[PDB]
């Protein structure tokens, strides 16, 4: 159940990033960015399928996995800046980039800011271009859909979406996470039990949950205000050929999100995967890998 063996690189901003590096004798480079509640360990299934052909770097973002969290992040751009410092330290010059969920937001922000480094971009159930809002909760724990959270302090007070996660991390409560993931993600298929245990251990490594939720409510690369923050207009700067992967039963990132990304990205193709939720890796790995391989080989 142990995590993969990790490499470590110290960055000029005082963080030390943990990463997996596999397929080191291969030519084409692929960089993988995980999402919320996960680290690079959640890329295991993709890594196993692609490491025979690609030189893969899968990093733990600051405050996840085995990376440090010496300074707090305020935005997904903070993660993208870490990725830039990371690729500078390792002297990577061109690579393809794939991000899952919140990691799709980081990947988009990175690609907008560092166009000369990104050959191809793949977004997997990515957060949308106007971020991921949090609503106040009623006495039944249901969202009050005209009561929008706007500050980090409000996020820290949420007793349904936020407080129980912080408590589960403090108390190392894997059962809480198993219940949540079975309800929202692993609704039709689950990881094999040993892999699921590794994933649950991975969730407990997160040290920045509130900060990441704040970065998600304030993420906005569109041309329009999202109700919390104005848009940076940067989605128009993503000229890399982009594949938008979206599941037809993703209960975390609904289908309209991927359709909107493909619409607004300048150079994007949308693939909606049948019988697929937030984890294509568990719901349809073979089909997902074929789409990725075809995109990378184009």
102, 76 Cβ separation under 8 angstroms? yes
Strand partners, 148: 135
Determine which helix (DSSP H) or strand (DSSP E) holds 19, and give its type and residue range. Answer: strand 16-22
Expressed in Å, this structure's resolution amounts to 1.4
Of the candidates 170, 135, 168, 164, the one whose C-alpha atom is nearest the C-alpha of residue 150 is 135
Torsion angle, alpha carbons of 162, 167, 169, 170, to 10: 140
What angle do the packed helices 76-89 and 209-217 form, to 10 degrees? 110
Cα angle 53, 56, 57 (rounded to 5 degrees) comes to 175
Of the candidates 7, 8, 15, the one whose C-alpha atom is nearest the C-alpha of residue 63 is 15
Q: What are phi and psi of 75, to 5 degrees?
A: -155, 160
Rg of the chain's alpha carbons, rounded to an integer? 18
Enumerate domains of the chain plus CATH numbers. 7-297 (3.40.50.1820)
**Own/partner pairs, 292-298, CB within 8 angstroms, 24+ separation:** 292/46, 292/50, 292/98, 292/122, 292/243, 293/50, 293/53, 295/120, 295/122, 295/241, 295/243, 296/28, 296/30, 296/54, 296/96, 296/120, 298/120, 298/241
Of the candidates 155, 135, 157, 158, the one whose C-alpha atom is nearest the C-alpha of residue 147 is 135
HSE at residue 104, side-chain half, CA atoms within 13 A, is 26
The contacts of residue 74 (CB under 8 Å, 6+ apart) are 211, 214, 215, 218
Strands 29-33 and 95-100 turn out to be: parallel
Per this entry, what is the length of the chain?
A: 298
Report the C-alpha gap between 260 and 77 in whole angstroms. Answer: 21
Helices (H), the chain: 44-50, 76-89, 102-113, 152-156, 163-171, 174-184, 193-203, 209-217, 255-264, 280-283, 285-297
């Amino acid at each position: 159940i142990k995590p993969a063996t990790m490499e470590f690189v110290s960055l000029s901003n005082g963080e030390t990033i943990a990463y997996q590096e596999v397929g080191r004798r291969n030519t084409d480079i692929l960089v993988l960015i995980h999402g919320n509640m996960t680290s690079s360990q959640h890329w295991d299934l993709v890594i196993e399928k692609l490491q025979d052909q690609y030189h893969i770097y899968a990093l733990d973002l600051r405050g996840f996995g085995q990376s440090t969290y010496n300074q707090s992040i305020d935005s997904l751009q903070d993660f993208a800046e870490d990725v830039k410092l990371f690729i500078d330290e390792l002297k990577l010059e061109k690579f393809s980039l794939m991000g899952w969920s919140m990691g799709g937001g980081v990947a988009m922000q990175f690609t907008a800011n560092h166009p000369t480094f990104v050959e191809k971009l793949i977004l997997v159930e990515s957060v949308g271009m106007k971020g991921y809002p949090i609503f106040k909760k009623d006495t039944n724990g249901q969202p009050i859909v005209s009561s929008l959270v706007k500050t980090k302090e409000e996020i820290a007070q949420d007793p349904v979406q936020i407080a129980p996660v912080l408590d589960a991390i403090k108390n190392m409560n894997k059962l809480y996470y198993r219940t949540v993931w079975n309800l929202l993600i692993y609704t039709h298929n689950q990881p094999e039990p040993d892999r699921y245990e590794k994933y649950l251990d991975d969730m407990l490594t997160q040290r920045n949950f509130v900060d990441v939720n704040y970065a998600l409510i304030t993420f906005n690369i569109s041309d329009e205000h999202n109700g919390v923050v104005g848009g940076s207009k940067q989605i128009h700067r993503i000229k890399a050929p982009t594949l938008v992967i979206q599941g037809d039963r993703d209960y975390v990132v609904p289908q309209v999100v991927g359709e909107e990304l493909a619409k607004h990205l300048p150079n994007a193709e949308l693939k909606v995967l049948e019988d697929c939720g937030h984890s294509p890796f568990i719901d349809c790995l073979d089909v997902f890998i074929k789409h990725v391989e075809d995109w990378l080989e184009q």
